[PDB]
């Protein structure tokens, strides 16, 4: 129960991290932050560092808050030209340690027609997002993630559609949709609303 919750949180910590390789030498942490922030709020960045060269070693780890952001970054940023080099975005070497929970979460997610939306402007609320996305079909829920303190939303959320066709169409259609001067990033959920 609470034990299952701890096991899931450990798996999720692993699942929220991506390896970013082939980082061009001109890039540093702020550029990596801006390149990977569209997919979800970044919880931390760990740049590689050489103490003798005083420079990074071409790679970094980006840590998100939900695994959908890491999945989306893997999908959308692998082989993107950052600076003068196409980057590699991959799983962390310990991703296998999220088994079996990683698969269990996906199987639970298959029961729902749920999508993940990031780069949601801080001035929008859940009903604003619902209105835009119900173009693709009836929505059962549209929830922006909120910080307990302040109650402000974190720039991302999840939408559950009644029909799989609708969630598929939203994911196929809405990437880079301009909402409030931010360009939405949209992907499938890999976790259920509730396990």
From Swiss-Prot:
Domain of life the protein comes from: Eukaryota
Tissue specificity remark: Isoform 2 is expressed in colonic epithelium and colorectal epithelium cancer (at protein level). Isoform 6 is expressed in colorectal epithelial cancer but below detection level in colonic epithelium. Expressed in heart, brain, placenta, lung, liver, skeletal muscle, kidney, pancreas, spleen, thymus, prostate, testis, ovary, small intestine, colon and peripheral blood leukocytes.
Phosphoserine: modified positions: 131
Disease: Verheij syndrome: A syndrome characterized by growth retardation, delayed psychomotor development, dysmorphic facial features, and skeletal, mainly vertebral, abnormalities. Additional variable features may include coloboma, renal defects, and cardiac defects.
Subunit structure of this chain's protein: Homodimer. Associates with the spliceosome. Found in a complex with RO60 and Y5 RNA. Found in a complex with FUBP1 and far upstream element (FUSE) DNA segment. Interacts directly with ERCC3. Interacts with CDK7 and GTF2H1. Interacts with SRSF11/P54. Does not interact with ERCC3 in xeroderma pigmentosum complementation group B (XPB) cells. Interacts with ARGLU1; interaction may be involved in ARGLU1-mediated modulation of alternative splicing.
Family recorded in the similarity comment: Belongs to the RRM half pint family.
Designated name of the protein: Poly(U)-binding-splicing factor PUF60
Native source species: Homo sapiens (Human)
Gene that encodes it: PUF60
Portion of the full sequence shown: 114 to 308 of 559
């Amino acid at each position: 129960l609470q034990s299952m919750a701890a096991q899931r949180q450990r798996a999720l910590a692993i699942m929220c991290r991506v390896f970013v390789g082939s980082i061009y030498y001109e890039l540093g942490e702020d550029t990596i932050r801006q390149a990977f922030a569209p997919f979800g709020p970044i919880k931390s960045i760990d740049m590689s560092w050489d103490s003798v060269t005083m420079k990074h070693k071409g790679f970094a780890f980006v840590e998100y808050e939900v695994p959908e952001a890491a999945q989306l970054a893997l999908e959308q940023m692998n082989s993107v030209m950052l600076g003068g080099r196409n980057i590699k975005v991959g799983r962390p070497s310990n991703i296998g340690q999220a088994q079996p929970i990683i698969d269990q979460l996906a199987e639970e997610a298959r029961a729902f027609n749920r999508i993940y939306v990031a780069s949601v402007h801080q001035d929008l609320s859940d009903d604003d997002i619902k209105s835009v996305f119900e173009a693709f079909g009836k929505i059962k829920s549209c929830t922006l993630a909120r910080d307990p303190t302040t109650g402000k939303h974190k720039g991302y959320g999840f939408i559950e559609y009644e029909k799989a066709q609708s969630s598929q169409d939203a994911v196929s259609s809405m990437n880079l949709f301009d909402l409030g001067g931010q360009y939405l990033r949209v992907g499938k959920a890999v976790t259920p609303p509730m396990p």
